[PDB]
Design a protein around this ligand. Structure first.
Ligand code: SF4
Ligand code: SF4
Ligand code: SF4
Ligand code: SF4
Ligand code: SF4
Ligand code: FES
Ligand code: CA
Ligand code: MG
Ligand code: MG
Ligand code: MG
Lengths: 196, 154, 238, 144, 378, 127
């Protein structure tokens, strides 16, 4: 409904539509055209701003446009004016050496706390947010925890006789960019999906 | 109500017990697979080679050291689920707070099936000469906990 | 250089190249037992089979990619139902007479067979899934036998990838291990007892399974439970 | 006369006294706070720490503890207080003992209501100076 | 102007002159555990024990949201009996959390007899969990294909007992607050949450529909088979701490309509997807199958491997819109897990709710937004 | 039939002979493997007289000159098996009703067995 008018527009003007078979679909706007065209979406009838997720792709196996990226989720609540119930995600990659990205606090009020968290846990600035202050991490935490290059910080778990375990060196689990315990990995160990 | 025993359900998640077979061998073949699935990194397993003349378990492999840090443990039974033998199985004992941190890592001898009671319960009943009273009851002891002798008038 | 197209991906590659390393250079992949680095490639385990076109004229039988040279403008199919169906059959045939000691096997999670089995096994032909078709007595034989003070052989586990015998002749040059009777009755064995070569331990790293195992460290911990430290040996100048 | 039968037999009683005069000041955080409001329903010495102690929240528990009558005891309820529990990371204090002297640890996640009962029943045998460790020693009635 | 400092586990900075309220600025983080980053270092099977630790009240919702999302990724199909067992469990977790919000309401209103009852109801619901799952909270029960194991022979006859006493019981509570003695004067005009504003602050947890906005995820983006149940979405007049309280209670009623409706179609069968690539094999054959032994060992050590991709499936908890945003790179363990915590975004509407209103009312004006710190903080 | 039961009754007996010979000629008897269907029987029932599936008569260096197996419980076409390692000699003993442990047609007695093992010891034994 209201999303058709979105896609029929992005197609026309160079916006990449990303689509997994499962029921979500993205649209990646460039840096600059984000601010304005994002407002375009509110007017179009997009009242609700469900979430806003920060992603660090540093340790991702395949390469991507720029190191960071933020995803927004837009909706038309199906219990209000006329709202159809169109929903989707909009994503933008963001330079590593320049973590700045304009706020949408003008348009949505929910975007307040949400933007703050993306800034606490990843180092992303929001040009013009009421107050970019740390939300979750303690006041004197040095840096931004949710990004890939920031250590989880684990303590060795302890038992008798000076027998100890280091969770990092212990996990039998693999990390996707991880080669495995034998030469290589392949087949279902590079991804598996059934055909319903 | 520490005067009237707590009635727990048969599925309840208590202190791990390590079971034996009828034969009397332990079921555990030291595979450290329980330890593997554990979200908490709360199990440490050292393996040893069975002596054919005087065997611990049925494999060629038994568990030389078996240790669970209960202060790390979450009681998810993920472990009992990973186990290929049916060795480690959550039990019924819950009365088990204690004083020194490192006194809360149990051992093989602390969780075998034959053992009644938790470290504190058995330690106090030591310097006391008064038999252990478990503060509970259950309708029946699971099929899985074969052997576990527990107060279950139901 | 020869222009080969693996699955959908096209790749340059020198003339003396295996269809295997062709397919691995491309990104894609395939089962892999008998074949090893720096060891003569042969087609013994028969798992790296692929489909081949030399147009679109596809060859009638499957080719072992490890012993086939790339021709120019060649096409390699590793995804077709035909291939997978075979792959999962080669897994099946291997595990046919395999032991069932996984938990209690020093070959921890570091076991090429284990791994490949779950990578390519159990075909998805398109009701309860059938794990094992074979339902007869397995191959019981000599078990847990130390060849040296340093090595321990498990004959039951061996899947006959020719790696160890192959390695002994080629690399150090000491034929101290070789196969014995023929057919389904064949096993690995020595008549040089001591395991005389000063390079015997290396079979321990090549063996895809837990037949040949470093006895210096029997039953210490599982493979993932080790804290690996990449360093250098300072026992001699090399 | 610090260690003479007079003074000795005296404090034995005083201890046995503040033994049954224990006034619990629960300091609940997450999920454990909810399990204990199922045990209390059926000027304080002895505070109970129930849950994940955050690193931001850590300095707070310190003040609350300090400003307290001087004969006091801390109970460490559940897995998150007793050690980092299953949250072995930056955000969380790995053992409340890292900040305040603990007198009794109680395993479980969250430990059953009646466990926390045994927990205090134990803290009793401890302020009585009648509790020993697995090494066979006699425990000091108070952490300090 | 006199700026005072309050501090449940929620530190509130109230700028205040007189008796009104000029602005509240909440400071949260005292329950920050760091789930989102710890989960990048666990199995998908191991992450199941992290979901119930956030909303420890309606914990089954998180269990569900996370599972439903993983299932999508790796094309897993949930058996009929498992979809039925999961909804029976879901709303049962739901009534357990509404009963808690209700009970802390029956205490502000002084009724101690109707409270000591609500506490026994919740205890009978927790009793039910320990029956099937052996835990009262954090039951490690939902799995990626369905559920750990089937339920015991004593679950159904027990659920019926609480399915015979609840119907009316619910109505008693509806009355006590509706036929409001005091309540009317303590609630009717406080916590003015205008419809057009809730839909801006993203408030969702029935605190939204108690404001006249007809939006429930189980109906607009249906998930675990709710598409096929009978459903009235309780609505409110003008959003206040009155409408808000009653809505939740009017919801508990519709949750029992489900529990009964589902109990009706419950039929014997498989409880988790037979796919050997997603589920470990039946243990009973671990004594026979090489393949089985191999898959088992490998399953519980290194995890299974979902394909590279990103997915978000929306669910509805007792507190609003829930959902997991999983990013997979084909590993044993997810690359990212962003949890959309309802309670977190529902809190931005607090500084507006008690705007310029009294101060003793600000306790109940917070409690009417049903926040759980583990949810907001996480 | 119940022949399945009586088979194992004989499998233990064969083992007994093996242990006898081993101590009587002073040579290594070795348990080579326990039934997997026993290690992984969880709570499941089990009533076979022992737990050993692969047994051997090895020598000074530990190399087997005689091997013995018996088909697991849940397996098809059950037989007990005598194999003289390096000399390509396999044997398949079944169980006849009212007859005994037979090799096709010949009674596999304690007498006939000892012959095989002695013959095999003198010849195959490395040290
Ligand atoms: S109950 Fe869970 S946390 Fe405890 S040892 Fe078992 S797997 Fe680990
Ligand atoms: S999984 Fe079972 S058999 Fe393996 S080490 Fe643990 S308890 Fe022992
Ligand atoms: S060799 Fe590999 S497949 Fe065979 S038992 Fe050992 S780990 Fe398992
Ligand atoms: S013992 Fe190992 S390396 Fe030698 S052939 Fe057999 S499986 Fe291959
Ligand atoms: S120990 Fe368990 S119940 Fe207690 S706070 Fe931690 S996660 Fe929640
Ligand atoms: S790897 Fe090519 S046949 Fe074995
Ligand atoms: Ca031997
Ligand atoms: Mg910074
Ligand atoms: Mg040996
Ligand atoms: Mg107002």
């Amino acid at each position: 409904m209201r999303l058709e008018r979105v896609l029929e527009e992005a197609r026309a003007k160079g916006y990449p539509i990303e689509d997994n078979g499962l029921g979500n679909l993205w649209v990646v706007l460039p840096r600059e055209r984000f601010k304005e065209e994002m407002a375009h979406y509110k007017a179009m009838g997009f009242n609700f701003l469900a979430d806003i997720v920060g992603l660090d792709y540093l340790t991702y196996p395949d390469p991507r446009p720029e190191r960071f990226a933020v995803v927004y989720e837009l909706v038309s609540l199906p219990g209000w004016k006329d709202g159809d119930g169109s929903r989707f995600f909009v994503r933008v990659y963001v330079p590593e050496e320049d973590p700045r990205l304009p706020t949408v606090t003008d348009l949505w009020g929910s975007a307040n706390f949400l933007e703050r968290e993306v800034y606490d846990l990843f180092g992303i600035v929001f040009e013009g947010h009421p107050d970019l202050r740390k939300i979750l991490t303690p006041e004197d935490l040095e840096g931004h925890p949710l990004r890939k290059d920031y250590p989880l910080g684990e303590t060795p778990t302890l038992f008798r006789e000076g027998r100890y375990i280091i969770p990092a060196e212990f996990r039998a689990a693999l990390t996707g960019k991880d080669p495995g315990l034998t030469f290589y990995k392949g087949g279902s160990r590079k991804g598996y999906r059934s055909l319903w | 109500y520490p005067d009237a025993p707590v009635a727990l359900k048969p599925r309840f998640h208590g202190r791990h017990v390590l079971t034996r077979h009828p034969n009397g061998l332990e079921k555990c073949i030291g595979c450290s697979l329980c330890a593997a699935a554990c979200p908490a990194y709360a199990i440490y397993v050292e393996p040893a080679e069975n002596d054919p003349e005087n065997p611990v378990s049925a494999g060629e492999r038994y568990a030389k050291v078996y240790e669970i840090n209960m202060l790390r443990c979450i009681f998810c039974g993920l472990c009992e689920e990973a186990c290929p033998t049916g060795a480690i199985v959550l039990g019924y004992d819950f009365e088990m707070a204690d004083y020194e941190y490192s006194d809360l890592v149990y051992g093989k001898e602390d969780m075998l099936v034959d053992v009644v009671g938790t470290k504190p319960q058995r330690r106090e009943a030591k310097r006391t000469g008064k038999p252990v009273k478990v503060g509970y009851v259950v309708p029946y002891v699971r099929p899985e906990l074969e052997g576990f002798k527990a107060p279950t008038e139901g | 250089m020869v222009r080969v197209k693996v699955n959908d991906r096209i790749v340059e590659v020198p003339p003396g190249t295996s269809v295997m390393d062709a397919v691995f250079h491309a990104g894609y992949d395939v089962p892999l037992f008998c074949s090893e680095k720096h060891l003569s490639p042969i087609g013994a385990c028969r798992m790296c089979l692929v489909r081949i076109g030399l147009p679109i004229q596809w060859q009638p039988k499957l080719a072992a990619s490890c012993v086939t040279a790339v021709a120019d403008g060649m096409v390699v199919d590793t995804l077709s139902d035909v291939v997978r169906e075979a792959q999962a059959g080669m897994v099946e045939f291997t595990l046919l007479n395999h032991p069932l000691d996984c938990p209690t096997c020093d070959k921890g999670g570091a076991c090429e067979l284990q791994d490949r089995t779950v990578e390519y096994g159990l075909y998805e032909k398109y009701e309860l899934p059938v794990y094992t078709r074979f339902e007869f007595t397995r191959r019981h034989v000599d078990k847990h036998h130390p060849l040296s003070p340093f090595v321990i052989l498990d004959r039951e586990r061996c899947i006959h990838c020719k790696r160890c015998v192959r390695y002994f002749e080629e690399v150090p040059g000491d034929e101290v291990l070789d196969f014995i009777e023929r057919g389904v009755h064949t096993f690995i064995g020595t008549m040089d007892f001591g395991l005389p070569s000063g390079f015997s331990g290396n079979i321990t790293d090549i063996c895809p399974v837990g037949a040949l195992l470093d006895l210096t460290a029997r039953f210490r911990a599982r493979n993932w439970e080790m804290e690996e430290t990449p360093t250098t040996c300072a026992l001699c100048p090399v | 006369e610090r260690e003479g039968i007079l003074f000795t037999t005296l404090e034995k009683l005083v201890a046995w006294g503040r033994s049954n005069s224990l006034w619990p000041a629960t300091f609940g955080l997450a999920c454990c706070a909810i399990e204990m409001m199922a045990s209390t329903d059926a000027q304080a010495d002895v505070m109970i720490v129930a849950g994940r102690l955050s690193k931001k929240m850590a300095p707070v528990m310190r003040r609350v503890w300090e400003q307290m009558p001087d004969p006091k005891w801390v109970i460490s309820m559940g897995a998150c207080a007793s050690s980092g529990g299953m949250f072995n990371n930056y955000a969380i204090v790995q053992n409340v003992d890292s900040v305040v002297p603990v007198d009794v640890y109680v395993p479980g996640c969250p430990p059953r209501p009646e466990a926390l009962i045994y927990a205090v029943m134990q803290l009793q045998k401890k302020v009585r100076g009648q509790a020993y460790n697995e090494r066979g020693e006699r425990l000091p009635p108070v952490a300090a | 102007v006199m700026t005072l400092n309050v501090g449940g586990v929620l530190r509130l900075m109230v700028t205040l002159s007189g008796e009104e309220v000029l602005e509240v600025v909440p400071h949260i983080g005292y329950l920050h555990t760091g789930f989102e980053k710890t989960m990048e270092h666990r199995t998908y099977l191991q992450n199941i024990t992290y979901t119930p630790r956030m909303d420890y009240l309606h914990s089954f919702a998180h269990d569900l949201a996370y599972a439903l999302a993983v299932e999508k990724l790796l094309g897993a199909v949930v058996p009929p009996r498992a979809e039925t067992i999961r909804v029976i469990l879901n709303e049962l977790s739901r009534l357990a959390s509404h009963l808690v919000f209700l009970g802390t309401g029956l205490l502000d209103l002084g009724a101690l007899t109707p409270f000591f009852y609500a506490f026994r109801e919740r205890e009978t619901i927790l009793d039910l969990f320990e029956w099937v799952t052996g835990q009262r909270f954090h039951h490690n029960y939902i799995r990626i294909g369905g559920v750990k194991e089937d339920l015991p022979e004593e679950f159904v006859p027990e659920l019926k007992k609480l399915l015979e006493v609840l119907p009316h019981r619910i109505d008693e509570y509806e009355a006590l607050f509706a036929e409001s003695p005091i309540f009317y004067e303590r609630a009717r005009g406080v916590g003015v949450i205008p419809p057009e504003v809730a839909i801006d602050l993203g408030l969702t947890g029935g605190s939204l529909r108690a404001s006249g906005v007809n939006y429930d995820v189980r109906k607009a983006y249906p998930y675990s088979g709710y598409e096929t149940y009978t459903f009235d979405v309780p609505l409110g007049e003008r959003g206040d701490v009155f409408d808000r309280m009653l809505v939740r209670i009017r919801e508990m009623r519709e949750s029992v309509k489900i529990i009964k409706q589902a109990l009706e179609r419950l039929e014997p069968g498989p409880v988790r997807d037979p796919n050997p690539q997603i589920t470990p094999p039946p243990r009973h054959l671990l004594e026979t199958s090489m393949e089985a032994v191999i898959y088992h060992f490998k399953h519980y050590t290194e995890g299974f491997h979902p394909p590279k991709g990103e997915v978000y499936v929306p669910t509805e908890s007792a507190r609003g819109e829930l959902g997991y945003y999983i990013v997979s790179d084909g590993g044993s363990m997810p690359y990212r897990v962003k949890v959309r915590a309802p309670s977190f975004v529902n809190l931005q509407s607090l500084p507006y709710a008690c705007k310029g209103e009294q101060v003793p009312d600000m306790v109940a004006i917070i409690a009417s937004l049903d926040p759980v710190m583990g949810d907001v903080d996480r | 039939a119940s022949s399945e039961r009586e088979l194992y009754e004989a499998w233990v007996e064969l083992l007994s002979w093996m242990r006898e010979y081993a101590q009587a000629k002073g040579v290594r008897f070795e348990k080579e493997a326990d039934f997997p269907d026993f290690i992984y029987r969880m709570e499941r029932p089990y009533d076979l007289p022992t737990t050993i599936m692969t047994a051997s008569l090895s020598d000074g260096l530990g190399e087997p000159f005689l091997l013995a197996d018996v088909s697991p419980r849940h397996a098809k076409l059950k037989r007990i098996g005598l194999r003289l390692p390096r000399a390509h000699i396999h044997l398949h003993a079944h169980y006849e009703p009212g007859k005994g442990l037979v090799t096709g047609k010949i009674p596999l007695t304690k007498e006939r067995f000892f012959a095989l093992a002695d013959r095999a010891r003198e010849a195959l034994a490395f040290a």
